[PDB]
């Protein structure tokens, strides 16, 4: 049940709520007040989903799908069978995510390390909240949120995207994709670098961070460093999700026309707006 070097860290303290009432582990899992909180929200939410499965007539994972209330209902309550379960489950989901982050904070205090992880996680929770709460409220109806279903939610993406033409033209969607692409590139390099140093040519001796820095300067003429690479990855990640939430928060709110047309502000600038020739003339 314990890692060879674990006992020394399993000391009392660090809890945010309830003192030492829930200060304990179950197997490897820590259980704070929030350990209990998330279980409560998750059990409930899984129950409501099972119950929504019956009302629908399937027990097939590829088929089950909880839909939000129809547009007619605007931002109000709705019958369980027609958008209500979705609303309650959304609350439970939100309760389960926020609790998990808070539980991570408590684990951070007991171990005496920084709070970067719970902090990073918050960005994901935020993207989720933009889709099921922020955008819908700003648009006037819970009907704009995505349905909870393995394929039905991809339908939402597809349809919502095509509602504004080729979504590729959303400018904030371009930034977002760039960060996602870049973060993967960066992750591939970081993992390969450290590994090629710890596992040098057959029989040779373990390389050093000096070699790591050398390899990169040789290659591209610059090395961000061991501390820099981790600051970078964290940043590329959080930025990718930040621009994602952002490209959506503006779609259907301050901009509801074709995204491709948004680009005329540039082509139609006074100066070149009239010159003949080119693609736009």
């Amino acid at each position: 049940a314990l890692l060879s070097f674990e006992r020394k860290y399993r000391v009392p303290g660090g809890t945010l709520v309830g003192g030492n009432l829930f200060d304990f582990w179950v197997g490897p899992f820590y259980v704070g007040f929030f350990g209990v909180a998330t279980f409560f929200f998750a059990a409930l939410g899984i129950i409501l989903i099972a119950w929504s499965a019956v009302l629908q007539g399937t027990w097939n994972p590829q088929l089950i799908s909880v839909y939000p209330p129809a547009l007619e209902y605007g931002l109000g309550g709705a019958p369980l069978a027609k958008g209500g379960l979705w609303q309650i489950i959304t609350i439970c989901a939100t309760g389960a995510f926020v609790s998990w982050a808070l539980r991570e904070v408590e684990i951070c205090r007991k171990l005496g390390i920084g709070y970067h992880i719970p902090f990073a996680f918050a960005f994901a929770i935020l993207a989720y909240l933009t889709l099921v709460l922020f955008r819908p409220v700003m648009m006037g109806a819970w009907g704009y949120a995505f349905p909870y279903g393995i394929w039905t939610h991809l339908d939402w993406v597809s349809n919502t995207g095509y509602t504004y033409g080729n979504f590729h033209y959303n400018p904030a969607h371009m930034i977002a994709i760039s960060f996602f692409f870049t973060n993967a590139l960066a992750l591939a390099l970081h993992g390969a670098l450290v590994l090629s140093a710890a596992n040098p040519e057959k029989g040779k001796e373990m390389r050093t961070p000096d070699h790591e820095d050398t390899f990169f300067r040789d290659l591209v003429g610059y090395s961000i460093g061991t501390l820099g690479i981790h600051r970078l990855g964290l940043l590329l990640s959080l930025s990718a999700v930040f621009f994602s939430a952002l490209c959506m928060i503006i779609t259907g709110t301050i901009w509801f026309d074709q995204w491709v047309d948004w680009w005329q502000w540039w082509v139609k600038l006074p100066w070149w707006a009239n010159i003949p020739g080119g693609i736009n003339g």
Partner: protein
């Protein structure tokens, strides 16, 4: 059809890959133990991987993992419950005993060497060419504790030469002796260096180093573990 073949093959591949990956991450901390240091009943579904050996860079030897694990230090802790799963309370001074958030591990009592075999970290006074090139220079600044009391003043910066980076601040205490403070735990302000993790009466407890011009992996761990433990233990 071909596509069906491809995707099915892939899932089998992916299962082997995850197996490999998981066993590879068991080269440390395993096998599992009971709260009493005894080998746990079930170790899970994955078996320990076949040992691998690292050839350390400067005649410093060999490393083989997985291998016999053992806290090569005493642990001043005592059970608080009659069953597995509960906190273990410190029997003495958690800070002084090195437990909980103030824990340290028995790393080699040697210093880390750069690619050429030289001490990776040196006081800046002994590193020719090095100087503060940007940001407030902390040297000469008084250091304050979480209790808003002054506990000393910075007298030097220990730097990472191959990575040209600040790692510790050498601080002189009223008794005339010095201690190292990790760079990541201090706040450099315009007219002073602030340290939250510790209160003024705790700087003296900070572990001290053998040689005045070098730190060993073992000493870094005791120093850092100590000041991080203050967050919890210095709290009052």
């Amino acid at each position: 059809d071909l596509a069906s073949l491809a995707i099915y093959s892939f899932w089998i591949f992916l299962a082997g890959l995850i197996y490999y990956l998981q066993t590879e991450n068991m080269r440390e901390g395993y096998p599992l133990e009971n709260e009493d240091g005894t080998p746990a009943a079930n170790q899970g579904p994955f078996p320990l991987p076949k040992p691998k050996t690292f050839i350390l860079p400067h005649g410093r030897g060999t490393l083989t993992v997985p291998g016999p694990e053992s806290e090569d230090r005493p642990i001043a802790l005592a059970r608080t419950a009659v069953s597995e799963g509960f906190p273990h309370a410190p029997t003495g001074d958690p800070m002084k005993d090195g437990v909980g958030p103030a824990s340290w591990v028995a790393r080699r009592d040697l210093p880390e060497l750069d690619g050429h075999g030289h001490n990776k970290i040196k006081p800046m006074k002994a590193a020719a060419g090095f100087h503060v090139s940007a940001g407030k220079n902390p040297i000469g600044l008084p250091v304050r504790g979480c209790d808003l009391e002054i506990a000393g003043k910075v007298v030097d910066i220990w730097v990472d030469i191959p990575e040209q980076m600040a790692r510790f601040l050498e601080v002189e205490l009223k008794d005339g002796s010095t201690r190292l403070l990790p760079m990541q735990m201090v706040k450099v302000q315009s007219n002073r260096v602030h340290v939250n993790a510790l209160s003024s009466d705790l700087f003296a407890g900070i572990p001290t180093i053998k040689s005045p011009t070098e730190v060993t992996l073992l000493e870094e761990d005791k120093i850092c573990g100590y000041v991080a433990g203050g967050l919890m233990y210095a709290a009052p």
